[PDB]
Amino acid sequence: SLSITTPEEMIEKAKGETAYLPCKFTLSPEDQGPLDIEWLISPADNQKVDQVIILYSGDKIYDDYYPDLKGRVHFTSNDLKSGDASINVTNLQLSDIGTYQCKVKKAPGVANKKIHLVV
Amino acid sequence: ARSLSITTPEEMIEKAKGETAYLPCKFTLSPEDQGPLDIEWLISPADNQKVDQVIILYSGDKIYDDYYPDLKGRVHFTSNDLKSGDASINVTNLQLSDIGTYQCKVKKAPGVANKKIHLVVLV
Amino acid sequence: ARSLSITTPEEMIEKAKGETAYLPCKFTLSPEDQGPLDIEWLISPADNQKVDQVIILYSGDKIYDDYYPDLKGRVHFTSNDLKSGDASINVTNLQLSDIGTYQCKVKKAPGVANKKIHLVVLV
Amino acid sequence: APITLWTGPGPSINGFINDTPVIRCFICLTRDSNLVTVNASFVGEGGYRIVSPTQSQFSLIMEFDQFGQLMSTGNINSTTTWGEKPWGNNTVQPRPSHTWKLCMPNREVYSTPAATISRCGLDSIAVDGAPSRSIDCMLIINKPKGVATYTLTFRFLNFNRLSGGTLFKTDVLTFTYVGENQ
Amino acid sequence: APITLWTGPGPSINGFINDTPVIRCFICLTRDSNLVTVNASFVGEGGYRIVSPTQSQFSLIMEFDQFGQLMSTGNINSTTTWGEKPWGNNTVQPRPSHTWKLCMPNREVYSTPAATISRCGLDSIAVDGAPSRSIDCMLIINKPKGVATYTLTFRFLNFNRLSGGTLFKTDVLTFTYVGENQ
Amino acid sequence: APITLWTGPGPSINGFINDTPVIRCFICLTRDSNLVTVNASFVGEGGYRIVSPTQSQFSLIMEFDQFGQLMSTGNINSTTTWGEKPWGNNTVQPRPSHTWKLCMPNREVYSTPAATISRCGLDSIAVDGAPSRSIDCMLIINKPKGVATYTLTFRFLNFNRLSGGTLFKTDVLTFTYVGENQ
Questions:
Q1: Do residue A65 and residue F79 have CB atoms under 8 angstroms apart?
Q2: Neighbours of chain D (3+ CB pairs under 8 A)
Q3: Residue D109: which CATH number?
Q4: CATH of the domain spanning A1-119, picked from 2.60.40.10, 2.40.50.1020, 3.90.1150.10, 3.40.640.10
Q5: CATH number for the domain running over B1-123
Q6: Is beta strand D83-84 parallel, antiparallel or unpaired with respect to D20-31?
């Protein structure tokens, strides 16, 4: 079945560095739906939770969602459909502190990974 | 008993003003009646258009009786051990406004039974 | 017949202005058609965006013919015995506004058939 | 088992107002395990094609006997196409079945009349759901009428909510009630 | 298989406000293949028989455990007549079944609370669906409460819509949610 | 038999406005014996997280082929998780089946476009059902769109009903239409 490698982590980083948030996944033969990936942020700063930061669907990337991370989030892989939904959060700030969730779907497959990012 | 039932489904009772009416509602439970005991009494008064107005309730082994303003402090369950088959009430200090049909509904699921009593208060 | 059917389910008819147009709708019922006979004619005029507008109907052994103001007094069922298989109508004193697609719908549940007639009117 | 009674698709003009059928009613009564869903839409015809804000309210009553068969006495009645929908096709089967009773409003649950008043959009696609292009439709369940055992009333109300003349082309309306026991 | 949990017809006074049962609720939860239809109607009793535009808003919460069984702790609770409706009769069967869970709101789909706020006509037949005789009823699905696994809340709102004193006799209300998996 | 097609629980951002996926749509189409219930809720994201009274109206169109398969051409389309819900679990099974057609709007019943405009409460729990926190959502059934055989459009309307900026967190919306025949 559909799985992510290391379904929970903590990454310690310093301000102005770029955090490599890994999300490597394995596909099952039954996973026949469209690959459907999203990363979310639960910021420690405020009340809102589970806020999209970047998206991959229809073999296209969409990233204009979270104003704070504008121009600072991107998928690292040139071949994301092969099993790598990892992202970079460049030029880390104090306000980036929070839980980052990677959700991979490829129906019936569903997996997610939470990373607690500390800056 | 074969099913939930009340004794004497229908009755007419006449009493003088200022007296207390004893309104019987005794019931028999069946083995299948495994639900919670859920009793209410209702008045449909001759006075006004309204019908099936709660006067007193028994549920969760508790009595509730602050429903019908004209009967305030004048309706009580007569039995101490109501759950052993006696949902009878008295209505004390009878007034002409008490004239109406009184209905005793007894539920203990899947059992249901009811009965009506036509009360008349005489000057 | 095997099912509810109309003879010649699409026609193209050309008439002169002032003429009377005979729009045929002959139908055969099947033995399974056990519901009430339920017939209507609709018009989709070329004049305007209005579509499937009822002009005449047969239901409950009665004719209703006051739906389409332009055809007041100008449309009628021709047959003396309509239930027997003849839903045809006359459209009298033809106008150029009468140009359109006329549809005969016959239902006798579970039977349903329809027929389209394209009426042109020339000066 | 489930059972559907309906007008069929392409309904006839089957809603009588003052002894002329003038409303084209699509009505579907679908009984699943316990509840009946009423799925209905209406199109005014002739003088009822466009309704004005001054339009008087009216009831279209369906009257059913104790076996769930439409009687000839209501505003929507047995003189038009009405019957069962088979699973798998769009036919209207007039041959009664004992199962038709299951489409009826439970007589013990609805021993006094029940109602649901809902918003009823008119010409909603063309007016793009403009708020003052809605009326109300009230379903009345088992309001007594003649010698019917069961009744369903579609009552069209509050036309004075309309801002002006509006095509009487209703939204698809849904209602629910507890179905009768076999 | 489908499953209906309900209060039965002629429901008891079973909706507690401030530790007194004052609202008579007919509630039916019917699970067909996937969705649960909530079919419900309410009559206020005693001091709640007639509500005014200044009636404060209130919630009647049903609390269920992990097996779809009504708990003792809600405003509508296990001291009232509640249980399964057999196909074919109007009894209320209190003997629990594993299938009762199928009436519960899917804990994965409603892992955060969902809501539907709907119109709630009062005394609709009598007042002929007059616009200003409606309040609102909001169904809240899985608002957390205590050790309950599932909750259904009927929250009565916006009494200030009322033109004046109105009999608290609601329309039949319908809501839908995705049922729990066995 | 019945069949449910859905997005799954915890749906992705799958509703495109102006070539960008911005609305997170929970959508369940549950076909029982005859009717299909649409059960749906929406959460605006990014620029659509909060909507204001001046928000322009928009449609989320689902396009389906003749076999009831979601096409790639709609605002909600086959690039997102979508497929059959098995009885007993919350998986989304993407493998087509002939039974998928059964969730489609009967093309003979809906041979011209049909609609239901309903209230759509926003953030209803948090704003406690404030009357000025509702918009409208209209389901349009089979409004033609390119090569699609079936369409379902969720059209969000009358944002100017809002008193102010509201979280675009919709109620659970329910609609019903007659299902296609196999």
A1: no
A2: C, E, F
A3: 2.60.90.10
A4: 2.60.40.10
A5: 2.60.40.10
A6: unpaired
